[PDB]
Design an enzyme around this catalytic site. Structure first.
Site, short mmCIF file in Angstrom:
data_model
loop_
_atom_site.label_atom_id
_atom_site.label_comp_id
_atom_site.label_asym_id
_atom_site.label_seq_id
_atom_site.Cartn_x
_atom_site.Cartn_y
_atom_site.Cartn_z
N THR A 8 0.78 -1.22 0.00
CA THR A 8 0.00 0.00 0.00
C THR A 8 0.82 1.29 0.00
O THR A 8 0.23 2.38 -0.17
CB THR A 8 -0.89 0.04 1.27
OG1 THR A 8 -0.03 -0.16 2.40
CG2 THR A 8 -1.91 -1.06 1.31
N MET A 9 2.14 1.21 0.17
CA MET A 9 2.95 2.42 0.30
C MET A 9 2.63 3.32 1.48
O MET A 9 2.90 4.54 1.47
CB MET A 9 2.82 3.25 -1.00
CG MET A 9 3.50 2.57 -2.17
SD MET A 9 3.82 3.73 -3.51
CE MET A 9 2.15 4.30 -3.82
N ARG A 10 2.06 2.81 2.54
CA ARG A 10 1.71 3.49 3.77
C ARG A 10 2.96 3.60 4.64
O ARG A 10 3.18 4.65 5.26
CB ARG A 10 0.59 2.79 4.53
CG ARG A 10 0.02 3.62 5.67
CD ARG A 10 -0.86 2.80 6.59
NE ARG A 10 -1.51 3.64 7.61
CZ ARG A 10 -1.17 3.78 8.87
NH1 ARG A 10 -0.14 3.14 9.42
NH2 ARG A 10 -1.89 4.60 9.65
N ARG A 11 3.78 2.55 4.72
CA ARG A 11 4.90 2.48 5.63
C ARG A 11 6.02 1.64 5.01
O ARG A 11 5.72 0.61 4.40
CB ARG A 11 4.54 1.88 6.99
CG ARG A 11 3.52 2.65 7.81
CD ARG A 11 4.07 3.95 8.36
NE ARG A 11 3.18 4.70 9.23
CZ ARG A 11 2.24 5.60 8.96
NH1 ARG A 11 2.02 5.93 7.71
NH2 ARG A 11 1.53 6.17 9.93
#
Ligand code: AKG
Ligand code: AKG
Ligand code: AKG
Ligand code: FE
Ligand code: FE
Ligand code: FE
Lengths: 275, 275, 275
Positions: free
Chosen positions: B72-75
């Site tokens: 998700t490219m969140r973290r």
């Protein structure tokens, strides 16, 4: 099946004629031309001419005065992308029943009259779709049709990928044939008719009628202009969840009834791609 | 209108200077460079150097240890697609206020300090956007700004299609000019400034202020790196539905008030394409 | 790490063997081949042959009789786009536990048996994913697995952009290697195996297990056919919001628990692109 795109007289439908032909068209094709509905090239000419003058010759300041601060194409002027400008590819002008942005009193008068004629014709043909299919929406017919329409005029100085509409009905007036729809499994031309409007049934027609109306896919091939009128339901439009599942809607809805907001979310979505 | 992208001193704005120039910039353009905010190339260098070393020379095992199980490219680390690898096109490193993934204590120390400086500057410039427009969010200013930010660093060993941001504000530091925005109807260069951060207003600025702030479209043309900081509201951020409709939001919301979750749904959406 | 895509016997897993190898596969890779599950090329042949005969030789009338009025690919026949036809690029046949559209009694008998074998194998391997990770879903295991599956067969007379699946698990049987997944940071071939099914873990595996299962990205390069079975949760599937945030989900959810409907919305979404 003949893959001809048929034509119906709104007046004749309202008199109770051609009901079997109309019902078959709605189920098997979901598109048709509509005459005798108060919309022809005569009503389009004034509106078309003044918005093209605005696109071609309005200045940046004039355009900014009728541009929304968020570029949603809901109201006013938009340059629409596929050195330079996003307006290089296409330009749009949008309106609804209120909260409109007009560049002058002349424009306002002409476009308010044009919108009203489109909105009237769209509610009238939706009323006949409902009647021909024996459909009473939850809350009744007139409250369903007193709704949230959107009118967009687009100038192109694929142009549009294959999709279906999520409206009740969509009315298209146009100025090589660019618009194409699936009919009988083949791409079929939808040319302009000076005497008629083109009607696409949308997915809300399918939903409200319990699957008695097809929502056909269509696309725009590659100057041209089109006027596109979406008749869109209110957020509180309520339907049966099991019946939606029985006619192809891939819903993720708990419980037996839902609203349009429940289904689509917090923002209108006008078109959907199968792919 | 001059189509110059202006520059403001955060300190001068906080002292109450240039208020008419600032208000006009927010309404007509929705982007500006910001100096005197605790962010320059000096603060970027340590963070940039150590993440590029990680992209170029970290091993697969090291990278897996800071990769989330859902991409998700969140973290943490992400290879981002447009034999081989999705990392062949671009690589990203993401962080927030908690639940972070760091490859070492050195990285952690440098990136936590960098994040804090970005988050502080973003809340400070959003506070000035609110003040200059006379805006008190429902629940008050400080609870609105204590929110859900996301920092993403992207390396490219169109790069990004035209879009607007759905943040309150976005802060960009960068290392031929790739970044372009619509200003006065023309594509305008946004080059790096060693002494300043670039600020884009997002659609939540437009929404909270009742339409007093523009959310401009922008795109990335085609090595380069950028640091992109999104200041994003809490899920329970509450606004007026009629006022949202008056400034261009095409909402499908029943009732008079709604939350950010009601509008966007159950997952953050950071950017939106008009087309 | 070896970047080999492993193979497991469902029977051996159910006997409690290879638990450490299985757990490591789920966390580090999120894909594997599955033998001894009641699915091989023997069970596929009858179903494949009769649907290809239908695609190639069924008439338009026969196809219309098993086409939904909205083109969602939920049930029945679909021509799927990337003079002519959208069927020129690909053709699909879809089914579930009910509300199916069959072109004949023979087709119905063969495809109902094939669906049941796929659904059984998918619930069985999901049960082992849950057991190996010590996971008890809210409401219990069997009510979680009695769910909303979707089977789609696709014929191609990129074919599919990089994405991850939003299922619990996905089972793929197939007929130059077109299917590719990220494993150890490199694109890895996923060829057919006459004796086995390919299992992709989806984002709901990641979510329910609290981040113990990877959901890997994959793509289809460019005739071929594939059978794709999505095991999808019920709309009322309930999870912890803080735990979802701890394993990478970028949720915008107020409060401590949420449902699948809360997260995804009112329509199933089967795949997601990082870009
Ligand atoms: O421009 C046209 O003729 C068609 C546009 C269309 O289908 C739409 O906007 O949904
Ligand atoms: O990379 C950049 O400079 C811009 C990226 C951007 O606009 C975004 O991520 O929203
Ligand atoms: O056709 C295939 O083999 C894969 C399709 C796929 O990944 C999907 O439909 O999610
Ligand atoms: Fe359309
Ligand atoms: Fe952006
Ligand atoms: Fe997939």
């Amino acid at each position: 099946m003949d893959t001809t795109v048929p034509t119906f007289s709104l007046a004749e439908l309202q008199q109770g004629l051609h009901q079997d032909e109309f019902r078959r068209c709605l189920r098997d094709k979901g598109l048709f031309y509509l005459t005798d509905c108060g919309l022809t090239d005569t009503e389009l000419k004034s509106a078309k001419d003044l918005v093209i003058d605005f696109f071609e010759h309005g200045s940046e300041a004039e355009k900014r005065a009728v541009t929304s601060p968020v570029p949603t194409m809901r109201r006013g002027f938009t340059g629409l992308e596929s050195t330079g400008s996003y307006s290089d590819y296409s330009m749009c002008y949008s309106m609804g029943t209120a909260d409109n942005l007009f560049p002058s009193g002349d424009f306002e008068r002409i476009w308010t009259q044009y919108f009203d004629r489109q909105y009237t014709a769209s509610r009238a043909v939706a009323r006949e779709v409902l009647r021909a299919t024996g459909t009473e929406p939850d809350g009744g017919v007139e409250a369903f049709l007193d709704c949230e329409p959107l009118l967009r005029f687009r100038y192109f100085p694929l142009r549009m990928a294959p999709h279906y509409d999520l409206s009740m009905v969509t009315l298209i007036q146009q100025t090589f044939v660019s618009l194409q729809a699936e009919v009988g499994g083949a791409f079929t031309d939808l040319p302009y008719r000076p005497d008629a409007v083109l009607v696409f049934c949308g997915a809300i027609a399918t939903l409200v009628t319990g699957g008695q109306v097809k929502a056909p896919r269509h696309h725009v091939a590659a100057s041209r202009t089109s006027s596109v009128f979406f008749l869109r339901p209110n957020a509180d439009f309520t339907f049966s969840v099991p019946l939606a599942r029985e006619c192809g809607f891939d819903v993720s809805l708990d419980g037996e009834t839902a609203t349009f907001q429940d289904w689509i979310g917090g923002n209108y979505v006008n078109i959907r791609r199968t792919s």
